[PDB]
Amino acid sequence: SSQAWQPGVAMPNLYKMQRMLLEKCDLQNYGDSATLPKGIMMNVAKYTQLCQYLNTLTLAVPYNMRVIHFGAGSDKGVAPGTAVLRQWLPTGTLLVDSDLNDFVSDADSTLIGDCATVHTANKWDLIISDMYDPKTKNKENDSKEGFFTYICGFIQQKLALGGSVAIKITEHSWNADLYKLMGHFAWWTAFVTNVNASSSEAFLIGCNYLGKPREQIDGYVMHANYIFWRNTNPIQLSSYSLFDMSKFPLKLRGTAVMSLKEGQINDMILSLLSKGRLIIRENNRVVISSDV
Amino acid sequence: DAAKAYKDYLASGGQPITNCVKMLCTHTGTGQAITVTPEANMDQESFGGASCCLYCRCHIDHPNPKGFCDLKGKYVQIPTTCANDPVGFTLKNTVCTVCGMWKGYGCSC
C-alpha cells in the first residue's frame, strides 16, 4: 500500500491508450469516508492533496504569477480552495477566484456570477476549476456543456503558452472537448485525491499548454477509458499525505515571461514550454470584470 | 456596533460562528498572530483570514477608514484552547506591535 501515503493516484498511460465503451461507474469504496484530521474541511484536504501532486509536475512559476480559480465558493459562504491556493502559491502571485453565488475569500479579487460573465484582457498562468452542479446528471451520460464551454474557450484564448490547468470532472459532469484539449498540452492526466477516492471525482490536469495538438484524443473514448480505469482499480481512502506539509509551498522558479508572435514559435521554444521553463504572454496590468 | 453585538450574543449562550477554514501546516511556525503563511506552532491552529473576520463574514463595512481588512488574504494563528471561536478570539484580543505575537498569548515584552 505504497500509494496510501501519496496525495492521490493518476490515470496510467496504459488506460489512456485503450478504446472502451462508456459504462456506469460502480466503485467498491463507494460509501466509505476518509477520516479527516480533527476539524479540517473536505475541500481543504482535497485542495491540499491536489497541490501536493502538482508540485511533482513541471509547472511554470513566473514572477507575478497569474492564477484564476472558478467555482471557489462552498455552501458555507467561505472559499476553502482559495485558502489552500494562497498558502501554496509564492508570495506576490495574483489570485482571483469566482463563483455563481456570493462568498468570502482570501483572494486578491473575487468575481460573483455565472462564469460566462467573467471577461479579461489578459492571459493567465494557471487555471483551477471546481465548478460542479449536483443536478448535472440529466438518463444517458453524454458530453456536458455550460461552464465547460467557457472553460474550453478560456483555455484556448486566455491561457498563456506554458500555463497549466486543473479542471474537476465526475462520472456525469464531464466534457468531450476538454478531453480533446488535454492533447494540446505537453503532458496531461486525470488525478484522484486519496481523501475523495471513494467518489468518481477527478481533476483533468494539463501541463505546459502548447497552443496546438501534439496528441489527437477522442473525448468520448477517453472518458470511457477513465471510467474503465476507476471501475477496475479500487483506491484506498487515505488522508496520510496531509501530515507532511514541510515542502508544500510551490517552489518559485522565476520562469521567464516573453511576449512572442505566433510566427516566432519554433521547436526550440516548444521544448522550453514542455519543460516548464517558459511562459508566453503579455506582462501588462491585469484587468478583469464581471458583467452585471 | 457589530463588535459589541457579537460579544453580547456569546455571553447570552449563543453558538460561536462556525466554518472557519482551518489550514494544514507543520505547526512549526513563528507563532505570530497574523502572517501571510500559516505560522502556527504546536500550541496553535492556523485559519484563513477572511473566514475569521466578523465584518467580512457578515458582509458589512469594516471598522477602518479605507475599507482595509488586516485579516483578509493572510492567516491568523489561534490558540488551540480558543479554537472553537476564532472570530471571537480575534475580536477580543490585540496583537503586540513590536514582537508580532498576541498580547497575553506569547508576548514577552
Ligand SMILES: Nc1ncnc2c1c(C#Cc1cnc3ccccc3c1)cn2[C@@H]1O[C@H](CO)[C@@H](O)[C@H]1O
Ligand atoms: N456557472 C458557474 N459559475 C460559477 N460557479 C459555478 C457555476 C456552476 C454551474 C453550473 C451549471 C448548473 N446547472 C446546469 C444545468 C444544465 C447545464 C449546465 C449547467 C451548469 C457551478 N459553480 C459552483 O461550483 C461549485 C462546485 O459545486 C459550487 O459552489 C457552484 O456554485
Ligand SMILES: [Zn+2]
Ligand atoms: Zn475583514
Ligand SMILES: [Zn+2]
Ligand atoms: Zn510583544
